[PDB]
Amino acid sequence: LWIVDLNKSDLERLGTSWSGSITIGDKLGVSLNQSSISTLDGSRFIAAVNA
């Protein structure tokens, strides 16, 4: 009997995804994408690229 296998796969990943927060005058805090201000006050918004 003859077992035989062939496998073939390719995959690509590209793009960014952003997060983080800003602050204005200790009066208002704007956050992007679930960044809690209760852990960060002056840490400005970051990014992440995958390639």
Add this chain to the structure above:
Amino acid sequence: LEEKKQATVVSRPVLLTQENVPAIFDNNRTFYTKLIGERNVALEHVTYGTM
């Protein structure tokens, strides 16, 4: 945030017998995919069963 997801998968088993006799086929491969990172290391995998 917004996105558009679309995926297809088409699979087929083949098998033969004689007439008036039973037969069984079953199969399960595990498909891996490359999570981004080699020292920051992790995997994820899905088994795909058929009977």
